[PDB]
Nucleic acid binder design. Structure first.
Lengths: 97, 33, 37, 141
RNA sequence: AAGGUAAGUAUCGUUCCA
């Protein structure tokens, strides 16, 4: 099923990004399940500069957030949380905003 | 000294007690240790 | 919906190359007057 | 470039850092065939004799010596590292990176400026010196 | 996304590793 594939790929990409975060073993950067990179504690300047990623990593994280948003909207449709009309309107809002 | 072969048992780097640095996460390879 | 997919086909090799450089065992990373001298 | 002394293996560069106490060891890590590295390996030529009193210059090919790439982040095409009494002297530039000069410059006075500033701050016993010029831009206009 | 790391001296904890 496609929705299963989306829920699978979201976990796979989330694991990839967590590996990229814990590539240098810096535990003060944490990725949530919505693909938002947040500090676990207020960043000291040395650690802030020490944990920075180029534009490519941020672009990958944001496109993963986009696909996660789409997959979660479809899951909402499958779980009866929203209507088919609501699902279509939400998808159009995602792809237009 | 110059013009001498490297010792067999020498640690290639850090033998002088050097300390590496991590300016950013992207640069370099994974720590893998 | 299609527009972001053309954007996807555009950016696919860029990320597939940057990640490959990043996630690998081995990592890799005013010039004419310096040329002919 | 080719005129300056070269180091072939990992032991030699560590010895060159250790075999000196009263000068500064300025090591140009990179590839002497690089257009970038050859741009500044002639600046380092034009001042090697001038700074003989307080500086010695060794060249290192990272491919020939693949022992300091991971620890000192040798992935920019050209890198300059200053060592004093077996201690890496950090230098604060206008750029974000404060451990190396990862770009090849053009003026033979500014590099002597930086080397002498490093020596002056290293005799005191500092670990981070401050460059006179600011490299947050290129002053082009 | 950056161009915003002060450099240090201490005991203590942990962990891999020799």
């Amino acid at each position: 099923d496609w929705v299963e594939v989306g829920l699978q790929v979201c976990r796979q990409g989330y694991n990839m990004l967590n590996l990229l975060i814990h590539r240098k073993n810096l535990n003060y950067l944490h990725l949530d399940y919505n693909f938002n990179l947040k500090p676990v504690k207020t960043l000291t300047t040395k650690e802030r500069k020490k944990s920075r990623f180029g534009n490519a990593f941020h672009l990958c994280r944001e496109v993963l957030r986009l696909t996660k948003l789409v997959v979660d909207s479809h899951v909402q449709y499958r779980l009866g949380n929203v209507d088919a009309f609501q699902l279509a309107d939400g998808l159009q809002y995602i792809f237009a905003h | 000294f110059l013009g001498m072969p490297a010792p067999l048992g020498y640690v290639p780097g850090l033998g002088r007690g050097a300390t590496g640095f991590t300016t950013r996460s992207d640069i370099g390879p994974a720590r893998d240790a | 919906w299609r527009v972001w997919l053309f954007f996807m086909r555009g950016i696919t090799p860029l990320l597939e190359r940057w990640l490959g450089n990043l996630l690998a065992r081995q990592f890799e990373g005013q010039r004419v007057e310096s040329h002919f001298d | 470039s080719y005129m300056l002394p070269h180091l072939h293996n990992g032991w030699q560069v560590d010895q060159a850092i250790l075999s000196e106490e009263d000068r500064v060891v300025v090591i140009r890590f990179g590839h002497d065939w690089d257009p970038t590295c050859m741009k500044m390996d002639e600046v380092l030529y034009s001042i090697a004799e001038k700074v003989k009193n307080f500086a010695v210059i060794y060249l290192v090919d990272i491919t020939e010596v693949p022992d300091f790439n991971k620890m000192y982040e040798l992935y920019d095409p050209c890198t300059v590292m200053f060592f004093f009494r077996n201690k890496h002297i950090m230098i604060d530039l206008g750029t974000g990176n404060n451990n190396k000069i990862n770009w090849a410059m053009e003026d033979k006075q500014e590099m002597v400026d930086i080397i002498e500033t490093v020596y002056r701050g290293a005799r005191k016993g500092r670990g981070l010196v401050v460059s006179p010029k600011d490299y947050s831009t290129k002053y082009r206009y």
